[PDB]
Ligand binder design. Structure first.
Ligand SMILES: Fc1ccc([C@@H]2CCNC[C@H]2COc2ccc3c(c2)OCO3)cc1
Ligand SMILES: Fc1ccc([C@@H]2CCNC[C@H]2COc2ccc3c(c2)OCO3)cc1
Ligand SMILES: [Cl-]
Ligand SMILES: [Cl-]
Lengths: 504, 493
């Protein structure tokens, strides 16, 4: 669906309006033509209309097709690619490539196949062809879309229609971007409630981190804005409830998951952790209640309000933050730590997925923080029959008290962690490209949340008048529209194709 | 098409178009109405901005009406009126005033929607045009204007047949290699031109053909030099000249039946009008200079004796032309204007019907002074082959006193188009090239050394001036006609 009044506000500007934007824009190849979907699209259209660039473009497309193809189709696709682009007599022979590069891509069947070739294709495209793009009408059209992207799109642009979750500080709504029809979730954090409980830093950290990360295993931020009452984060719609809910509340007499299902989630969570750790961000809040399912059954991590982004030269942070019983010993002992803490929380998360209780507490046990801290430091975890030898070994490797001994991020990746035999039946390629059929597909009829009639109301916040510092802070927060998700939306909903006209 | 030269037709990077942008001095009329590529890009612009849809479609439908077969007109008028002009019309043009609308809804006739079109184009020339200049479409126009100015000299043209030989040179049938378009190429030998002092005539012809754009005058498309020649690439006229058709087609029956002569006269008149409206006197109208194309439509050619009057100047002097076709005022060494061309039209027409000139008997060669004496002093007689109308028309054109001669008045030949000779000509269809010509030439029919010359600065410089390159309107037409423009105007295949 759509609404035509808001749709009518999506129009491409005159060129003279784009002059300021052109001078202040980052012209990096990677940032413009590879990472930004409208940039990439316009760059490809440019390549498509200039014959000399056809081989490069088509090779690029055919590598991406090979990368995301079923295992059964791959050998044949590799044969066709080779014959089309890497045979010297072929119509679309890629003669710009180094002969060495061509000879290596003609050989082998290993998991690395065509990655080096792709790097050479993109390194070529980044030179003269990109320079021609910049001097073409397709680059100017990109500026028009960037101008449109930067226009005011706050609260009036969204139509809520249902509550998805809520906590102490506000609600998450399923909403609709009125112009395009795209379904999103909107986190509304109440201003007064946040001022009272000193929650500003957390709201800001999450917003910044979600704006700059782009991963299929982490919820994305598409817009950020304020209203009279709230600070609003418009993000990936996740309809399927959180993992805590699916452990305890769904099939109550069978709490916890079968092992294949828990392994799948674990793999998806690992992939999202890795994405953060490669960007030097420590999550610090991994737990079942912050892992969310979408409609297809795939999961994403969420709530980045406690995350730390390391600066260059900094390998560790420090401090008490997170949830009792997901916090690692190094953290509880007051030591500096890196990403290791997230993998300890991964262990606790998996334990709970299989066992339907924490590893440091009995069912329903509520203990003093100091007693819980002692158990985490000193008490060996025990595993019931529900754990297979591989489940158990993996948990043991993550719940290792010494961070140096714990499985995790090494040599810039989680590749070592992936060889653990727990994951022996996971095709990582298809996992990372979102191709694997999930183990549980949520029901469209069903609300995976607390019944609205059973939600405790919160008292009103009295006498928190807003000073200048609050209002200035609200304006910093409301940085508006995030480029990559906004471009994805325009393309997905057909607005791009509709407005990207030339000769109707 | 030849891949090799087709490959050279590539749109430039935008940065290469900066100088052109800076020096280009075009208004709405020059850019979006008169230049076929600007008009096309301007219409493309309008088609993508929904608010300009009514104006764009109305414009196209008027032009569609103007060039429609008479049988299709009642219904085209009907549909246009119901779509744009009637009270709750879906494509109502609110920018028009009510008087313009009411009048366009009333009546029939030829200029039925001319006032309306004038109003549509005046509106489109204001804000819609300004918006166009701030669009990608205008930049694309600059890119085509850049391509238009690139060197396209002799190597771009394949010769394949001789169409005529003259004194100064030859006309070849040729083919633009990149587009495959057929043209005629007139090559004037440099050394003969110098030795016989024909520079003036070559330059004058080139300038004039470059600044005229009529379906009744050979169109100049490219002008360039080679080592041996000055070349003019122009409308291919394959069907022979009128002298040839009068005297050589059916030898036992020379001359044309009257309706055929009148058709050609109407076309000739329209060419003359086009020159006289631009202040040019032709001065060499005669059957040998009027050529037929493949369809049997004619155009005037050989503008080497022409003269363009300076702004303000209304008469000129100078002995030039062909004996028998020169008017008395010219023969008498007086100042003259466009009137000389009309005298020559009378002679031309007379000869089309009579298969001889009005002043000499069949095969009769006379001293120039005996012929001068006749043109100045003798009344022309008319054999029985002339209807009263054609005699009356010839008489009016052959008046010895230019003040009494039928010709060009009030900026046009409308007064002349009114003569009863032309009662069966539909001027609209003629002016538009829709009328089925009376004679259709066959393809299978072939209707048809200098020493001691050394060149200097002054010569090679004259040569370089002459090689001005490509003429915008005919080039743009070529690009559209042959599909090159369409091929290089795609955004997303
Ligand atoms: F302010 C707050 C509101 C709601 C909560 C929820 C409490 C229970 N566990 C999940 C928490 C996050 O809820 C969601 C649900 C769907 C979403 C989403 C986040 O982002 C994309 O789609 C936490 C904080
Ligand atoms: F240099 C010269 C060559 C030939 C002549 C010819 C002499 C006989 N009568 C007509 C003269 C014009 O010849 C043509 C023929 C085809 C044409 C053309 C002109 O222009 C476009 O296609 C004049 C001058
Ligand atoms: Cl371009
Ligand atoms: Cl535009």
């Amino acid at each position: 669906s759509r609404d035509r009044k808001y749709l009518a506000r999506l129009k491409l500007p005159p060129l003279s309006k784009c002059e300021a934007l052109r001078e202040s824009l980052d012209l990096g190849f990677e940032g413009m033509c590879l990472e930004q979907p409208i940039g990439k699209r316009l760059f490809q259209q440019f390549l498509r209309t200039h014959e000399q660039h056809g081989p490069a473009l088509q090779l690029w497309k055919d590598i991406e097709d090979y990368d995301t193809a079923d295992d059964a189709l791959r050998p044949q696709k590799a044969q066709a690619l080779r014959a089309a682009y890497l045979e010297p007599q072929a119509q679309l022979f890629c003669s710009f490539l180094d002969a060495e590069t061509v000879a290596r891509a003609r050989a082998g069947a290993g998991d690395g196949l065509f990655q080096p070739l792709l790097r050479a294709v993109l390194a070529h495209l980044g030179q003269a062809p990109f320079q021609e793009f910049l001097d073409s009408l397709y680059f100017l059209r990109f500026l028009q879309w960037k101008w449109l992207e930067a226009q005011p799109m706050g609260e009036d642009w969204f139509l809520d229609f249902r509550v998805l979750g809520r906590g102490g500080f506000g609600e998450v709504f399923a909403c609709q971007m009125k112009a395009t029809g795209k379904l999103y979730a909107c986190k509304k954090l109440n201003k007064k409630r946040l001022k009272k409980r000193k929650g500003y830093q957390g709201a800001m950290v999450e917003k910044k981190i979600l704006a700059k990360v782009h991963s299929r295993f982490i919820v994305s931020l598409a817009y950020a804005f304020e209203t009279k009452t709230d600070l609003c984060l418009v993000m990936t719609i996740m309809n399927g409830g959180d993992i805590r809910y699916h452990i305890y509340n769904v099939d109550e007499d069978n709490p916890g998951f079968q092992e294949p299902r828990a392994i799948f989630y674990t793999a998806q969570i690992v992939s999202g952790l890795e994405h953060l750790h490669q960007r030097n961000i420590i999550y610090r809040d991994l737990k079942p209640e912050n892992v969310l399912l979408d409609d297809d059954g795939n999961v994403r991590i969420s709530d980045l309000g406690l995350a730390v982004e390391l600066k260059a030269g900094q390998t560790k942070t420090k401090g008490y933050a997170g949830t009792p019983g997901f916090m690692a010993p190094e953290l509880l002992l007051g030591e500096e730590y890196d990403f290791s803490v997230d993998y300890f929380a991964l262990g606790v998360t998996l334990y709970e997925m299989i066992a339907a209780r924490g590893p440091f507490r009995a069912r329903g046990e509520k203990v003093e923080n100091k007693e819980l801290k002692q158990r985490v430091l000193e008490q060996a975890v025990t595993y019931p029959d529900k754990f297979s030898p591989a489940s158990k070994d993996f948990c043991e490797a993550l719940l290792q008290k010494d961070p140096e001994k714990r499985l995790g991020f090494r040599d810039g990746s989680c590749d070592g962690l992936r060889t653990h035999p727990l994951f022996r039946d996971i095709s990582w390629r298809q996992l990372e490209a979102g191709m694997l059929t999930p183990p549980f597909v949520p029901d469209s009829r069903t609300v995976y949340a607390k019944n609205i009639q059973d939600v405790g109301a919160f008292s009103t916040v009295k006498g928190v008048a807003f000073e200048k510092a609050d209002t200035e802070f609200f304006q910093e927060f409301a940085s508006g529209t995030c480029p990559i998700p906004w471009q994805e939306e325009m393309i997905e909903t057909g607005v791009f194709g509709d407005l990207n006209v030339w000769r109707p």
